[PDB]
Design a protein around this ligand. Structure first.
Ligand SMILES: COc1cc(OC)nc([C@@H]2CCCC[C@H]2C(=O)NCc2ccc(Cl)c(Cl)c2)n1
Ligand SMILES: COc1cc(OC)nc([C@@H]2CCCC[C@H]2C(=O)NCc2ccc(Cl)c(Cl)c2)n1
Ligand SMILES: COc1cc(OC)nc([C@@H]2CCCC[C@H]2C(=O)NCc2ccc(Cl)c(Cl)c2)n1
Ligand SMILES: COc1cc(OC)nc([C@@H]2CCCC[C@H]2C(=O)NCc2ccc(Cl)c(Cl)c2)n1
Ligand SMILES: COc1cc(OC)nc([C@H]2CCCCC2C(=O)NCc2ccc(Cl)c(Cl)c2)n1
Ligand SMILES: COc1cc(OC)nc([C@H]2CCCCC2C(=O)NCc2ccc(Cl)c(Cl)c2)n1
Ligand SMILES: Nc1ncnc2c1ncn2[C@@H]1O[C@H](COP(=O)(O)OP(=O)(O)O)[C@@H](O)[C@H]1O
Ligand SMILES: Nc1ncnc2c1ncn2[C@@H]1O[C@H](COP(=O)(O)OP(=O)(O)O)[C@@H](O)[C@H]1O
Ligand SMILES: Nc1ncnc2c1ncn2[C@@H]1O[C@H](COP(=O)(O)OP(=O)(O)O)[C@@H](O)[C@H]1O
Ligand SMILES: Nc1ncnc2c1ncn2[C@@H]1O[C@H](COP(=O)(O)OP(=O)(O)O)[C@@H](O)[C@H]1O
Ligand SMILES: Nc1ncnc2c1ncn2[C@@H]1O[C@H](COP(=O)(O)OP(=O)(O)O)[C@@H](O)[C@H]1O
Ligand SMILES: Nc1ncnc2c1ncn2[C@@H]1O[C@H](COP(=O)(O)OP(=O)(O)O)[C@@H](O)[C@H]1O
Lengths: 155, 156, 153, 153, 155, 156
């Protein structure tokens, strides 16, 4: 069928392996994946840098930013699909409310969810930044370039 | 992108507009959709398959099949790399998480993708439709006409 | 009876969890109809309720063959009252009320939170503990207590 | 006013999610008091409600400095009405009602399930989408729609 | 302080690694652990056999059965503690109702919970028996003796 | 069984009967209990520590300490092999699961054991107590007398 683009939105503050698992699991299912960030501990430029480094190895992944509604981004770019991860019930209820709205905003865009893998269900940007603030080891939670940037941040 | 098949599993006893919401939202996003039914409840397998075929024959690319073994083995046999499931509620969510955790052990090449039921159809289930049909309430908002006819005849 | 609230259930048997909700409702409506459909027969269940609510003069006990929302219409009740104990109650009641609103848009379902002492009580766990001869006086009214002890010794 | 129900909130601003609950309550009590405490000032919030409920003759809008349960006492309301949308609403309301019952055992809180069309609407998401110039006519009444467009253009 | 016994109740139909993770995590925290079963696919005698084999290696673990209330078992035996696992929200609400009752039945017995490890959050006796019915591999979910018994059962 | 220490962490701003429910249920089950407080909210650290000490001085074996680093490192420094936490609600549960998953990565020798709050104290939190105290409702059911006195003086 036709050319397909999916958009994976987030603040990526910073990007983690929780985020990359979803991105990686999505690259074989769409022609292109756009990782999209709006417009926190890392600046926009820094967050964009961390993502690009962390998805270097996935040639069908682009990193962009946008100031506007997500569904309007999808519409400019010709994406029909938003991809979101779910780890837990609090994610689930929140994501339900977002999609209910997005469907009002633009009914041609669908949101598809995938369940986080077993090992990553507990990771978020927040808790990684908490562990990094106490300088504990974060190598299992984030890629090597992001590991370096967190350690320099919480020096 | 090469040829994609997605699989929509269920018991469909009977198919409702809650199930069709998901099926019509998936038909444009893959080359083919297989609706896959397992192997009593109130309609036989052959009846459930007939109801589905009549309820989806307006779509271009939806096939209705039975199985037998594991869902993930059905997906491998047919070349589907995706399972599609609807989420309505928190309790759906927790159950689906347990199933996908297991299916990833069984075959980590198959992804399960979820979509949220539309707000109008969240509350519908085969079970509650049969309840209401048994009391002979008007069920035309809940199921397609061919299914409506079959329920009415089941329940008098 | 300008206003009637209906309190449905299986009541197999009625417990102080059910009575909590019933007693809290009495002052808010001219009449309350406890409406019924296991371990106890229908006739038995109805008698256990009748005896348990006889101290509440605006509460009446009935049975119905048909949809709840058609009962409400028939008696002129515009309100169904349901108790909530837990997240699982909440989701289940959300589905039932979504459908009831489709069946009859003019009846509302109102919920009350179970009181904290009675949040863990169901007919099922009372019966289970009764089968083991536990002391059940804190969970059910005296007439139900007797019926449970008779059933299970 | 044999019976008064109180509907509390921040209403910052009132949306059709709030109005859903208010409109569904009007027929069930002699009076409804919408009771108030952000993006809009108190005075602004009160005006937006007043204009949004002027078609409902038994609804009045008030503010209070003090505990909700003391307001209810003061006006003679024995019922607080709250809407439930989701599991997270449910848990939060359970804690508030547990405490309100301790503060005044004679006031009951009754819940209604938000209607399915309006389940996802909050003041917060309406404001967010308004900040982006989205069409908001399906989420808020016309007088609130104007106030949001004025605020955000 | 004094001698301590904890009781880990269940139907163990059959025992899984989800169950054994909790048992194992509990053995260093009490002087004795009693695995207790009341009085399904495996008979009582079979279930007791599967447990004893699976906890052979934990010398402070006993396996018993009882027909009576759990808190009365704890009381006969001098246990002050029931240990239960939690995997998910549905577990949580159910376990809350059980403990609320058990506290009425006997207030001297406390129930302590531990969270299932990441890898075992999805396993139950039920789902293992479903996988075993389709003869898929269950070696990651159950110990070797139980693996053998399931395969012979779903031959 | 050798000497056991269990640690009860929190902010305790201020300690309430909800926190004490857990602390009194744990004092008989370990040799020692450390109540461990982190490192504004409405009471300073030194005040929060004072309130706890006065609220627990009737128990035999409860010490009140501050830290600084990671909880799990506090446990290692002190020889505690157990963290005790109360659960009131589903939302407590999900949050605690995320924390214990992480703490097991940080130190897999420390176990987190949970107990359900008693039904009478489930709804209490430091937050709601301060709310009610600010309106000068009677708070004697919610906090011990020494804490009751301190809240009253905070809020007039
Ligand atoms: C479905 O996934 C998300 C994620 C999300 O925030 C991460 N917000 C939204 C919003 C849902 C309804 C209200 C406006 C929606 C929005 O579009 N806010 C701007 C926004 C945010 C994030 C990005 Cl990456 C962009 Cl381009 C643009 N839906
Ligand atoms: C994600 O969707 C579903 C749905 C579901 O319903 C029972 N079960 C499964 C199962 C999950 C792991 C254990 C066995 C798994 C299985 O395969 N169970 C039977 C099953 C077989 C074959 C078919 Cl064709 C169906 Cl439709 C259904 N995953
Ligand atoms: C807390 O852990 C459990 C687990 C559980 O079932 C696995 N039931 C109970 C029950 C809770 C209240 C009602 C009676 C309680 C019971 O005691 N039922 C008999 C019973 C069951 C299991 C066993 Cl192993 C025994 Cl010895 C004896 N609490
Ligand atoms: C199980 O109990 C708690 C409670 C809690 O509250 C913040 N956080 C933690 C944290 C969980 C993993 C990431 C860092 C972990 C930590 O250690 N965070 C700071 C923290 C430090 C030191 C102390 Cl002494 C306390 Cl009380 C609290 N686990
Ligand atoms: C709000 O409370 C209940 C409770 C409940 O029990 C199961 N079912 C219902 C119904 C759910 C919508 C589908 C039909 C429903 C019904 O009306 N079933 C007949 C019914 C049941 C209970 C009673 Cl007491 C009566 Cl008179 C008549 N709504
Ligand atoms: C049931 O609905 C609400 C809503 C709510 O808003 C936050 N708070 C409350 C309270 C929760 C118990 C502790 C005191 C509580 C209170 O009474 N706070 C003053 C208060 C708040 C809202 C209003 Cl509208 C008023 Cl008049 C006065 N119960
Ligand atoms: N109110 C809320 N309830 C539940 N989760 C929330 C809430 N607000 C933010 N989040 C979560 O915080 C994270 C940050 O936001 P988001 O822009 O989606 O992605 P990211 O984590 O990539 O920066 C998300 O994983 C989101 O699910
Ligand atoms: N906690 C739960 N445990 C078991 N099943 C659940 C739970 N929550 C939702 N469900 C499932 O929803 C099912 C109906 O869906 P399914 O059998 O997959 O077919 P269909 O999609 O045709 O309705 C019920 O059999 C029920 O098992
Ligand atoms: N999926 C479900 N979740 C929660 N409760 C359920 C479910 N299915 C049936 N029930 C019944 O709803 C009950 C509340 O019962 P109701 O219909 O009012 O009769 P009663 O209150 O006498 O039990 C629970 O005690 C249980 O018997
Ligand atoms: N922990 C919480 N969970 C859910 N809602 C919360 C929480 N804390 C505060 N709220 C507020 O409760 C609101 C319901 O608000 P309420 O107190 O009635 O004012 P309003 O309805 O105008 O928002 C949500 O919109 C939110 O602003
Ligand atoms: N109504 C229910 N809701 C949630 N979980 C349940 C329910 N009924 C049984 N269970 C679960 O089924 C399993 C079997 O029961 P139990 O006797 O505790 O242990 P086991 O799994 O060792 O046989 C448990 O893990 C228990 O949590
Ligand atoms: N979803 C959640 N996210 C963050 N915190 C939560 C959540 N649910 C409950 N809590 C926590 O309950 C806390 C109060 O407990 P804590 O800070 O450990 O100390 P204390 O035990 O003294 O109250 C709040 O800060 C709050 O963060």
């Amino acid at each position: 069928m036709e050319h397909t683009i999916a958009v994976i939105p987030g603040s990526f503050d910073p990007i983690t392996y929780g985020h990359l698992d979803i991105i990686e699991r999505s690259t074989d299912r769409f022609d292109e994946i756009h990782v999209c960030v709006l417009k926190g501990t890392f600046s926009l430029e820094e967050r964009m840098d961390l993502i690009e480094q962390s998805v270097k190895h996935l040639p069908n992944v682009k990193v962009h930013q946008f100031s506007g509604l997500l569904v309007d981004y999808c519409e400019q770019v010709g994406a029909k699909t938003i991809i979101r991860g779910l780890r837990a019930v609090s994610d689930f209820e929140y994501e339900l409310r977002l999609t209910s709205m997005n469907k009002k905003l633009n009914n041609e865009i669908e949101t598809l969810y995938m369940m986080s893998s077993t090992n990553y269900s507990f990771i978020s940007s927040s808790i990684v930044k908490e562990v990094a603030a106490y300088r504990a080891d974060i190598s299992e939670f984030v890629p090597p370039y992001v590991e370096k940037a967190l350690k320099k941040k919480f020096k």
